[PDB]
Design an enzyme around this catalytic site. Structure first.
Site, short mmCIF file in Angstrom:
data_model
loop_
_atom_site.label_atom_id
_atom_site.label_comp_id
_atom_site.label_asym_id
_atom_site.label_seq_id
_atom_site.Cartn_x
_atom_site.Cartn_y
_atom_site.Cartn_z
N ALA A 129 -9.79 -8.43 0.68
CA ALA A 129 -10.04 -7.58 1.82
C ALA A 129 -8.72 -7.16 2.44
O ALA A 129 -7.84 -8.00 2.65
CB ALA A 129 -10.86 -8.29 2.85
N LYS A 130 -8.58 -5.86 2.70
CA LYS A 130 -7.54 -5.35 3.58
C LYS A 130 -8.03 -5.58 5.01
O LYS A 130 -8.84 -4.81 5.52
CB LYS A 130 -7.18 -3.90 3.26
CG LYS A 130 -5.96 -3.35 4.00
CD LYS A 130 -5.82 -1.82 3.89
CE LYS A 130 -4.89 -1.21 4.85
NZ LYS A 130 -5.31 -1.10 6.24
N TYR A 131 -7.55 -6.66 5.60
CA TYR A 131 -8.10 -7.19 6.84
C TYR A 131 -7.24 -6.76 8.02
O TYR A 131 -6.03 -6.49 7.90
CB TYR A 131 -8.12 -8.71 6.67
CG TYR A 131 -8.98 -9.54 7.62
CD1 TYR A 131 -10.37 -9.61 7.45
CD2 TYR A 131 -8.41 -10.35 8.57
CE1 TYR A 131 -11.17 -10.39 8.28
CE2 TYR A 131 -9.20 -11.19 9.37
CZ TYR A 131 -10.57 -11.21 9.20
OH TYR A 131 -11.35 -12.08 9.96
N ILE A 182 0.85 -1.18 0.00
CA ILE A 182 0.00 0.00 0.00
C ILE A 182 0.90 1.24 0.00
O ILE A 182 1.67 1.46 0.93
CB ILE A 182 -0.96 0.04 1.20
CG1 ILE A 182 -1.49 -1.31 1.62
CG2 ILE A 182 -2.07 1.06 0.99
CD1 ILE A 182 -2.63 -1.20 2.65
N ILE A 186 -12.35 -5.01 0.09
CA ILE A 186 -13.05 -4.50 1.25
C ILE A 186 -12.03 -3.88 2.19
O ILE A 186 -11.07 -4.57 2.58
CB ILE A 186 -13.85 -5.59 1.98
CG1 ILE A 186 -14.83 -6.33 1.09
CG2 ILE A 186 -14.50 -4.98 3.22
CD1 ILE A 186 -15.93 -5.48 0.49
#
Lengths: 326, 326, 327, 327
Positions: free
Chosen positions: A174-176, A14, A146
């Site tokens: 998903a960015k969990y 990111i 997500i």
């Protein structure tokens, strides 16, 4: 073709939105350093990253202007030239604005959007589900990641939410966050590639090695060698059953993160998420994240030292692992 | 067209919704403001003798209107008012630059001020929040500001030192205030602000400080304004005579009318459905047509609707009762 | 004779309720522990092959038993066990001196350790929580301590540096742990503690660290212990063979059985009705008689009871299924 | 002879600490109440003209005193007061039966009532909390009850419908209340309760409802009671004359004196150090000796102490100023 979960593997980094020197001033109109943006993208591709995320919280999705967003994404897309998948971010205050932004950024050439929920009013479960259904209906060619951030978005992304998301083809990842209920969420949502945070990848990959093949990294913005070595060593561990080296890398990563939170307090980190992340990157020296856009341009000086120390620790890991990648 | 001050803020300040067309819940819809209903509401409010009009808070759907809708709504309001009463738009947004952009345009159209919360993707701290309002006032010096002190929506809790700082900003003339537990202190800390309690708290607040507490904000007026006008008038009389019995009886009626609004009496639940519940209550009362909620906040549990509708009917009953007394 | 250590803590650790007489909800009642049901539960657990017994947490009504009830309960348990498995009482109280008083008496009766939360009238901070456990261990050096890490009850959130400090205290041998999101780190910070995940999380935790994660805590066993025993046995086999599929199937069954326990899936609501919901589930399962809740926590919304009872029936069904697979 | 009613609750109600001996922070100490300082405080308060005495809330260390200490403290208070002013003990405890036991004994010793919060290991819901107070009142019908409405300590938030239910309980005569945001409504819902605002809020509350709001609770008085007595007297005069200026000036002085008490202005931080901060402020003021805090709440960050001490000095300065104005 639209990305699927099958296509999401390895180290997903990111990136910030690089700032010009005047970016803290509300008078400034074009605050994205587009050349630094291009330089970061090429450096990440060269390091062997599997995919790029952007435009979360520290990526200043909240505080960029629309023209800045379009210019940033255009620069990214032109630099990547289809070599790795790329997700923009289009979290906004309402469904129609999300759709507008998502259509334009995907049109420019992002593959998907890393997408949280509207947060002026706290969403409930059916509202949140229908929100993602609405976006996927409106922009069927966008993959969705997500962005499961309860601090920012108030909604807490519970178990039944994941079961519903797995029925939406566009939702591929998903960015969990914490992995306490990852085992169950994996069962509830077979069609999503859940990305743990890099520090949790070791544990998550041991829970479910078949499903947990990828992770998200902000530490890579201080030098990506560590994330690449974690990725590579986890692949080897899964084959050999010898997890010692992966564990050593993971433990180094947690130590490097240990000073980031002000007084070890996550609620305090949440308030200064942008400034702290950007400051750590600035201190590491691998890229220039630059000043924070208003309003989030003031961080208590004492909190800055902890972020800068974390940045230096990650830079030291990058030096160490660069040598081990040979 | 000289800038409002606190001295100019007195009496009943009614917060109006943004009337919806029948298709306003559908993300495909592009022009969802009923501009004629907007004009009709404004004239009705002026006819009732309201002192000022507020708009574009939470239930006013500042979060979920498009920009073109916002401009059209405000244009219609300004053209209808034709300078007869002061009017505040709302320009709460994700960042300082967007706030400024919106505030400049809406004040240019002819609003007198903006009812303004803080950016809320990231929870602001005290100095960040202060500088935010300083930045807006610096950028748009002709705008009056009403502090929209809503901690549920905006996360920041608008503490004592914040009010002391706001009193130094000439543009900050009023506040849409909530609980009155610290009103006595806040009045001392901020001499230059007209604090507007919610209508149900006006009785108590006016008794605390009758010199300073001369105005209040009303959403109940959207179910028929006679009650608010009678409260205003009777409090003026009570301050002169020292006989507070009638003001107290009206205030008690208002609290009873509100008593079923919150789902299971729970404010956190009300906060999630603030838009749908307010709009449903107004629709039930029949004094105006608030209409469907813009996405994503277009789903309210059916059981919660009955309480809102019952409150709307109770306020309509108050309006009939007090119409006969005026 | 010698104090328990982490090395002695393995397998299925079952947390038992404090069985109630029919009149136990009434503040007028004075001796509300069914001591014979207590004895019967203990022998049944030992017979099932449980490795150790915990008691006197939240649903165990540590908060709402009288002192005489507590002494009688523990006496009955100790005389029933006759040294065959380790046993932890619970002595969470409002202050350090009361904790010490209770801990000394219950250890004297013959419990091996105390499952211990922190005083919670005032939210503790990190140094005060650390010193509290140091103080108890100093005062009662023969007691093993199980950290009862329950932030909802006790307000304090049992953070990373807390675990690092506890690992310096020899008496602290185990923890009744909750979510495993930071288990990997906590294990590194606290080498000398056997961290017990909740049974539903044991599968995942054991895969994270199979060397360290050899034990778990079970309330589902109170609805029939065969499921917990099966999970224990199959995880041992998985660690040896590398084939985790059966352990995964048992773990998945356990999570499904738990799926209706929380009112509207809401943990904050579960926290308010922790006692009544747990006791109702056990009553519905039919393996033991947990009985009425002591005051004040003797009222649970009727709609929430059905979810607890459904969970109890699901666990009873698991026990029947796994009983057959054991035998 | 007969049980207090709301009609009997007027003026300045001062909440006293439980004075500590020098060894009171050490868990080994067994009799940590300075009984003579207790007697001295009571006589001083009576001499200042206080209307009633409250005790044994949070900073009064209800949570951390032993039972023998509590009995000795209350005995000393009762024998000192000799029926001259009303006195409330505190009996908040982990369960209804313990509350009842303590309440019966302390009332028997001669307290007139109990300042009573709710059991807090498990967060109570509305019907549970209501029934709890009904149960206590049923069990100890001669005890007056002061509702101790502290959501930080007790988790339950004491909502509007709770006050409506309490007004049906004759024993419930007063409340140690907090923020006055919903005081107007609560007064309507509960006609039979004398709501005590905190002293800093008394000015505002008395202007809201001068008929009902005739009394307040004071911790500042422990730094010298003249300020509270002057506030009381001046509010009486204001209600008669309509001239509120002097009452306003006193009230504003009180808020300024409190302004440094909370660590970084943060109430959640104050809540963690409620005991140590209050006792430190009293120690700094010099009017009484509150003394060390009983374990576990015996460590306060040094930086937070200065703010408490500064508040204590400010209140002592007010006491000197208002002592002269009473003369």
């Amino acid at each position: 073709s639209r990305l699927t979960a099958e296509d999401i593997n390895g180290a997903w980094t990111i990136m910030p939105t690089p700032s010009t020197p005047d970016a803290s001033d509300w008078r400034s109109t074009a605050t994205v350093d587009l050349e630094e943006t291009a330089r970061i993208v090429e450096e990440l591709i060269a390091a062997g990253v599997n995919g790029i995320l952007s435009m979360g919280t520290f990526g200043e999705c909240a505080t960029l202007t629309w023209d800045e967003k379009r210019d940033y994404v255009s620069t990214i897309v032109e630099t990547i030239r289809g070599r790795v998948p790329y997700f923009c971010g289009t979290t906004a205050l309402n469904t129609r604005e999300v759709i507008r932004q998502t259509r334009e950024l995907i049109d420019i050439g992002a593959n998907g959007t890393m997408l949280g929920v509207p947060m002026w009013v706290k969403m409930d479960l059916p509202t949140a589900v229908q929100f993602y259904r609405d976006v996927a209906d409106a922009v069927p060619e966008a993959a969705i990641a997500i962005y499961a951030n309860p601090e920012a978005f108030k909604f807490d992304f519970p178990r039944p939410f994941w079961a519903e998301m797995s029925k939406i083809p566009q939702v591929v990842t998903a960015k969990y966050l914490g992995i306490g209920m990852l085992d169950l969420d994996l069962r509830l949502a077979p069609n999503i590639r859940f990305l743990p945070h890099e520090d949790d990848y070791y544990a998550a990959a041991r829970i479910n090695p078949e499903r947990i093949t990828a992770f998200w990294s902000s530490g890579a913005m201080c030098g990506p060698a560590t994330a690449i070595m974690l990725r590579d060593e986890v692949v080897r561990a899964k084959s050999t059953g010898d997890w010692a080296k992966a564990k050593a890398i993971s433990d180094d990563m947690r130590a490097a993160d240990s000073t980031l939170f002000p007084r070890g307090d996550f609620s305090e980190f949440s308030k200064y998420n942008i400034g702290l992340e950007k400051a750590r990157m600035d201190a590491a020296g691998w890229l220039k994240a630059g000043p924070c856009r208003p309003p989030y341009n003031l961080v208590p000086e004492d909190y800055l030292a902890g972020a800068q120390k974390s940045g230096k620790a990650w830079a030291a890991l990058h030096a160490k692992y660069s040598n081990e990648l040979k």
